[PDB]
Amino acid sequence: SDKDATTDGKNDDEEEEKEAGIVDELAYAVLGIALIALGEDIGKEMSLRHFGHLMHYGNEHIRRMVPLAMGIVSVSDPQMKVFDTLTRFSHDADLEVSMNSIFAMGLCGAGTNNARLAQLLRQLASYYSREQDALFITRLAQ
Amino acid sequence: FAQLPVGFKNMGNTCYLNATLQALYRVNDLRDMILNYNPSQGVSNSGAQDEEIHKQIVIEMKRCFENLQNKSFKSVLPIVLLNTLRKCYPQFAERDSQGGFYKQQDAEELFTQLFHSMSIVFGDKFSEDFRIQFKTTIKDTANDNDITVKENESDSKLQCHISGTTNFMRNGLLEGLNEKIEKRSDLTGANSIYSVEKKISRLPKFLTVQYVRFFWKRSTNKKSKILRKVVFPFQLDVADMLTPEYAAEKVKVRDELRKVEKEKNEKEREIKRNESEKDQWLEEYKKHFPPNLEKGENPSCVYNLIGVITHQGANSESGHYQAFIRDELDENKWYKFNDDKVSVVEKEKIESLAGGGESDSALILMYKGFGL
Amino acid sequence: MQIFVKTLTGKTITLEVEPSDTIENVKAKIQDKEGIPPDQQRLIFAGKQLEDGRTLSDYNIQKESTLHLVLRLRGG
């Protein structure tokens, strides 16, 4: 509950108060992941997944850099359910952002098999991001 | 994920066995015969009681190879085989002081001993598969007064004798199948220098050439290792070491096969933008093979490169043999077998193993007949 | 019996031996004249190794033959 709440506070606050603060709240999460890995082993499993949805809820303005940067590192870390949650943000306009996700995620997926359970999550995520020349967009906001 | 074979985990002081086996199993007849072994395969009977130890060894290869092909496995045991080999030859069964455990020597010797065992079990007809027959003329320098012709001289691999005559493999092969024999015998003269030229009279279907790397220094009285750069072509042509007659036969078949090989290399690239397609070409290739072909013979004078054993580090007295084998499905895709660490490497990595220096360099090269 | 031994430097020397003699005598005699110690010597004929416990008639080894000498190397 604690890990989901810390993130959930940041997302909820940042839309409603103004919108230029949205960019700043992204940095807390990056540091939060580093803190949570030496603080609790179990706590890490939850916070990886919350980060991808931190971005999607708050509607950050930088959708190019951060999912791809997260994604390489998060292959080692347990819980591949992380990639799925990164791609809900990344989807933006389809085949804009989503090209890099497909390219990067197909490498780590093909390259590494370490359980057929782990493989299933990694596959699901790439296919989400794309549609067909930006058929629809997703915004958590109204 | 993708399909990739398994390797051997080195116990330690065992790589001389582990490294060598991999290269051998690439060879298509080799892997086949160990699988299709029966306890009813005809033996080269003249008596002998070690024929029975030879049988046991071939069973151990068969199960190692079954482990290797099947994925329910990530490590292939050499332990049952090690026990059989130590019974068979009691030189591997000694004990080192201040170092430890069971005596460690010699991937060359080991390939020799393994082919010996297989040829007893699978007969002399199997001996011909890697065995090379020569035509040797032993003849005086100037006018001949004493002459002998030897075909009973034979080998199962070439010995490229380095003496600083290597910059290319062919030169050193040519100066170690060319030689001068000095005599210490009474004729009507004595100490006549004879020119000896060995020429290959029967090609093997599978070629092995070993580089000789050792020397006894006599100016310090201690073993050293020769280090030299020798480029080896992936595509090896032995035309100049055959007699004219035999060369004429194999070079004409080779040139037609190179026409079909060219035709494949063009067609392959187009369809890109596999096994069955190779078989459609194989049925075309076999038609240009000569009608006088016999058992234990390459239908060409050309061979392609399927294995390199490399030896790395410092002196001889020391060694950790890693190896390179070529994929059995590909032709420019190579697997690096560093015991159970198996990886894909490219042509460029194979090229780099020419050597000189403390780096990886070649000791044994495995090829096989049929260009492609 | 006169036999030929192809050394590591790819030069052929002769050796005077017997077909009843053991490989240990053969290797001892090369030790006298070159200095090489038997337990590093490997005498090959037909691509088959001739162990210390073998002789020079087990594989029909007569005169005008050439054995191919190569040397050992340790490790594992």
Curated annotation (Swiss-Prot), chain A:
Spans of repeat PC: 68-99, 100-134
Membrane-crossing segments per the record: none
Origin superkingdom: Eukaryota
General remark: Present with 306000 molecules/cell in log phase SD medium.
Purpose: Acts as a regulatory subunit of the 26S proteasome which is involved in the ATP-dependent degradation of ubiquitinated proteins.
Family: Belongs to the proteasome subunit S2 family.
Designated name of the protein: 26S proteasome regulatory subunit RPN1
Species this protein is from: Saccharomyces cerevisiae (strain ATCC 204508 / S288c) (Baker's yeast)
Name of the encoding gene: RPN1
Part of the whole protein covered: 711 to 852 of 993
